[PDB]
Design a protein around this nucleic acid. Structure first.
Ligand SMILES: Cc1cn([C@H]2C[C@H](O)[C@@H](COP(=O)(O)OP(=O)(O)OP(=O)(O)O)O2)c(=O)[nH]c1=O
Ligand SMILES: [Ca+2]
Ligand SMILES: [Ca+2]
Ligand SMILES: [Ca+2]
Ligand SMILES: [Ca+2]
Ligand SMILES: [Ca+2]
Ligand SMILES: [Ca+2]
Ligand SMILES: [Ca+2]
Ligand SMILES: [Ca+2]
Length: 903
DNA sequence: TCAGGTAAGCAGTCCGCG
DNA sequence: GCGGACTGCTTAC
């Protein structure tokens, strides 16, 4: 076995490393690492070290790390660049692991934990830790066991032991429904006092020290609470045993409107699952309570209990403990699905960084580029100070608001990384500049050719063509990984649709799901066996295909994010390779590419249709074009098609055999015009969209930039069993829009695109009639809530107070002088409801914490004074009026001459 | 919301617009 | 009532 690190830290002049040795065992070592840094030297001096520009450098070896850091400061005092990796633990990792790391996850101790703290006087603040910790469940991945530490005696109540027998029972038996598959994996430990609980927890921690530490809100709550509680009871030295090197620090996390404190545990990598989820899930949720996310991800029910959480232990300790265990399990279930831990390990080891550094793409790229350059004996530049400056981004075409019946879209593969590779954009490949004409002149191919020697971007930048820069080289590697995983994702998607089709005709038999690899397109033999399977087996296969698709999605989308972030890192002042010339070279090239190809596609289609000056490209955003296919369908005639799938096949063939070759020729010409290193602008068909054949559906519509809806039959080669709505930007897609309203608007859109005006009118009339019956939570708006203090003037709205903030202030007055009432947390999300004139709350709206029922202190009054009329107009009617006006349809039936006959 | 980037939409405040 | 200047928030890319 090849060795690999687990954690690394600098503590004074020592590196502390936990690692897995060549025998598969966990070890710890302290190394008096002597770092090297670099200074420029005369050309006459012999060396093997050169900076990224080819200037010679001398290596300076220091007696210790403090000396190296002190030298950096003196070099600044003198006014000379101090070159090399100034983060010494990254240099240590590079020296110690000078090969591609192959890691074994089964040797890595991943701990998931959750704590309970009974608090009668509000939220138990981690910084204070004034209340006993009365439950800890700690799952260990190596043992595959849930360790449960249960406090039976507290100042807030003495309780009986938790019963595993009752826990396993159905809720209909009075049990807690702790999943049968984890019942045998629970190791239960009751304690008669908190001191013994915490002492045993620390001994346990010492025996089974987490490498990766995760859970839900562990970084902001569980970890600081445990640390501060142990500190309060036993003193600092005991609390620091949570670090394998006995070193901790309070770290201040600063944001624009305040700060918070966390505990850094040296020698542990904390990956709080709430933060993994926010970074890697590509969702925006109305609430981030574990309950809300578990329901969303797993379709598991809410963990139900009576009374407030502050009385749950006292009233129902059995359920209190069971729910603590289930909470830990739900995070593991989410990870089994999403695989964010696996992703973090993959990317961390690839870059050779502390695993927790995967949250920072700048840190990630700094390490990848450093390791790459080091291998060539090249020396990285010193990081410099830069003022933050704005720079231009993508082009977005202004669409004509309208219905659009038949639409085919086309999209460039990994645009920004492909631009970097094509142009050869890198710190060390800058060759100079040329005199820029207006962008319009390059788009229309009338500007003079920028260069006959160098590779160019229309922002004026020129790049070397003799060899790839380090940025293009390293971005290509991660791009290739992304491409592989996307392949697996798309195959699983296509396989899912095969199963959906088979589910139309399930067989009446008892059988089992097929053992197959969903990452690869099903063979003919598998397809034949699938046609003979029962619904139970097919549904099990569908679930497995969809889980495979999710795994592929996680792996691909976040690798996409990583490579895209390199383009943005070039525009971030903290990146070692910050250069607005390079950042702008990327975005400006993108603007040209989109508008260039718009012109080319319009020219091609005008030629094939025999017209002049007609716009076939109706829209584009960044790297995509949307093409009207009405005329293409009309040339064959709608009556000539047997069914919907027939014209979809036809448009698919037209895009692949005629349009893509024309698009490719257009981009190859653009490559020559800019004299680029390599043609990498690959624009493939994305969506085929239209109404069902023979229906009155409108197919699609646009209301404006970044606001449209399409009825899609085929997406990137996936032919759907049922048509799929692609809706971007509209209120159905916004977390701020009430849940039931999202649903209603989506059905309105479905009816518009698939069925027509009359169907839409029927549904509107019904929703308007019935909506007052909807649950208040389902019709509440959602908003993030920043700067509550700023707009608070003695409990009342100050000047320019935002609507959602006004709601919070209203809530605050209504719960005034009440410790048990849920508090709205600064920077978190709230539900918002309008209030009718003359209500007892004394204002036009109220807001409360999202993902929760409003406190019984005011619930019935909120329900009684809810302004349903305002709700409907603002969240439903106004957006719908926008959709229908754009589509040129009416959501209410207009008066006609036939009304004079009504019978 | 500690953690690559810009473009751009809509809600709402404040207040002008004879 | 709408629209501009502005803040706040949220998406598309
Ligand atoms: C989605 C996304 C795009 N972008 C920018 C960079 C992208 O290259 C460009 C186009 O966006 P996309 O077309 O969404 O993504 P992509 O072209 O990089 O990858 P794919 O092969 O899946 O089409 O917009 C971001 O900066 N951040 C993002 O999160
Ligand atoms: Ca809890
Ligand atoms: Ca398990
Ligand atoms: Ca793209
Ligand atoms: Ca594609
Ligand atoms: Ca069948
Ligand atoms: Ca795109
Ligand atoms: Ca795509
Ligand atoms: Ca009441």
């Amino acid at each position: 076995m090849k060795e690999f690190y687990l954690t690394v830290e600098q503590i004074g002049d020592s590196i502390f490393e936990r690692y897995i040795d060549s025998n598969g065992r966990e070890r710890t070592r302290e190394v008096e690492y002597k770092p090297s840094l670099f200074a420029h030297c005369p050309e006459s001096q012999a060396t093997k070290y050169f900076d990224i520009y080819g200037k010679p450098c001398t290596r300076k070896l220091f007696a210790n790390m403090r000396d190296a850091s002190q030298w950096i400061k003196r070099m600044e005092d003198i006014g000379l660049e101090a070159l090399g990796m100034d983060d010494f633990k990254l240099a240590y990792l590079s020296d110690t692991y000078n090969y591609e790391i192959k890691y074994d996850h089964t040797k890595i101790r991943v701990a998931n934990f959750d704590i309970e703290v009974t608090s009668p006087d509000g939220f138990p603040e981690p910084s204070q830790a004034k209340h006993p910790i009365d439950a800890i469940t700690h799952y260990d991945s190596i043992d595959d066991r849930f360790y449960v530490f249960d406090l039976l005696n507290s100042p807030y109540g003495n309780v009986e032991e938790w019963s595993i027998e009752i826990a396993a029972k159905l809720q209909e038996q009075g049990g807690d429904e702790v999943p049968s598959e984890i019942i045998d994996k629970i190791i239960y430990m009751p304690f008669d006092n908190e001191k013994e609980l915490l002492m045993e927890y620390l001994n346990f921690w010492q025996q089974k020290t987490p490498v990766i530490l995760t859970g839900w809100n562990v970084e902001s709550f569980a970890i600081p609470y445990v640390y501060n509680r142990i500190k309060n009871i036993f003193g600092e030295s005991t609390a620091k045993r949570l670090s394998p090197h006995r070193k901790t620090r309070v770290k201040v996390i600063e944001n624009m409107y305040g700060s918070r404190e966390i505990i850094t545990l040296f020698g542990i990598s904390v990956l709080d699952y709430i933060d993994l989820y926010k970074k890697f899930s590509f969702t925006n949720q109305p609430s981030y309570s574990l309950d809300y996310i578990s329901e969303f991800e797993l379709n598991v029910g809410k963990l139900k209990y009576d009374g407030p959480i502050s009385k749950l232990r006292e009233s129902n300790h059995q359920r209190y403990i069971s729910y603590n265990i289930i909470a830990v399990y739900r995070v593991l279930q989410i990870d089994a699905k999403r695989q964010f831990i696996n992703l973090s390990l993959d990317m961390g080891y690839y870059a050779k960084i502390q695993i927790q550094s995967v949250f920072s793409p700048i840190k990630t790229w700094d390490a990848i580029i450093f390791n790459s350059l080091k291998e060539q004996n090249k020396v990285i530049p010193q990081g410099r100070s830069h003022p933050v400056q704005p720079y231009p981004g993508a082009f977005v075409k202004e669409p004509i608001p309208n219905r659009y019946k038949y639409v085919m879209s086309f999209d460039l593969t990994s645009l920004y990384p492909s631009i970097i590779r094509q142009v050869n954009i890198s710190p060390e490949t800058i060759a100079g500049t040329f005199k820029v004409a207006p962008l319009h002149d390059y788009i229309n191919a009338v500007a003079e050719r920028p260069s006959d020697v160098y590779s160019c971007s229309p922002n004026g930048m020129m790049y070397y063509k003799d060899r790839d820069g380090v940025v293009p080289t390293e971005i290509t590697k991660v791009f290739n990984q992304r491409k592989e995983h996307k392949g697996y994702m798309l195959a699983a998607q296509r396989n899912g649709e095969i199963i959906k089709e088979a589910l139309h005709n399930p067989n009446l038999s008892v059988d089992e799901p097929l053992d197959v690899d969903y990452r690869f397109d099903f063979s003919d033999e598998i397809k034949e066996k699938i046609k003979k399977l029962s619904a139970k087996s097919l549904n099990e296969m569908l679930f497995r295909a969809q889980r495979t698709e999710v795994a592929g999605m996680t792996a691909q989308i976040n690798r996409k994010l990583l490579i895209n972030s390199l383009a943005g890192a070039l525009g971030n002042v903290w990146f070692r390779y910050y250069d607005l010339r390079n950042a702008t070279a990327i975005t400006t090239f993108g603007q040209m590419a989109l508008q260039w190809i718009e012109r080319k596609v319009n020219e091609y289609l005008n030629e094939v249709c025999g017209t002049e000056g007609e716009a076939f490209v109706l829209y584009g955003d960044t790297d995509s074009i949307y093409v009207s296919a009405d005329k293409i369908i009309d040339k064959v005639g709608e009556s000539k098609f047997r069914d919907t799938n027939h014209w979809v096949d036809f448009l698919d063939k037209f895009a692949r055999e005629r349009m893509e070759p024309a698009i490719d020729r257009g981009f190859r010409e653009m490559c020559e015009y800019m004299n680029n290193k390599q043609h990498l602008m690959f624009m493939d068909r994305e969506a085929i969209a239209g109404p069902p054949l023979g229906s009155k559906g409108i197919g699609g519509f646009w209301t404006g930039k970044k606001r449209y809806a399409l009825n899609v039959w085929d997406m990137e080669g996936t032919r759907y069993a049922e048509p799929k709505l692609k809706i971007m930007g509209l209120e159905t897609q916004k977390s701020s829009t009430p849940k039931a309203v999202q649903k209603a608007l989506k059905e309105c859109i479905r009816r518009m695109l698939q069925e027509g005006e009359e169907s839409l009118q029927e549904y509107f009339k019904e929703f308007e009639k019935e909506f007052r019956q909807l649950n208040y939570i389902s019709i509440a708006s959602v908003s993030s809530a920043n700067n509550i203090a700023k707009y608070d003037v003695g409990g009342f709205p100050g000047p320019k107070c935002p609507f959602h903030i006004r709601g919070i202030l209203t809530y605050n007055r209504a719960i005034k002088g009440n410790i048990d009432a849920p508090q709205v947390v600064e920077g978190e999300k709230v539900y918002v409801l309008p209030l009718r004139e003359g209500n007892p709350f004394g204002d036009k709206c109220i807001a409360w914490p999202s993902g929760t029922e409003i406190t019984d202190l005011i619930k019935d009054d909120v329900l009684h004074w809810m302004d349903y009329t305002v709700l409907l107009e603002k969240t439903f009617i106004k957006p719908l009026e926008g959709f229908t006006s754009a589509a040129k349809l009416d959501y209410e039936k207009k008066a006609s001459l036939f009304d004079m006959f009504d019978f």
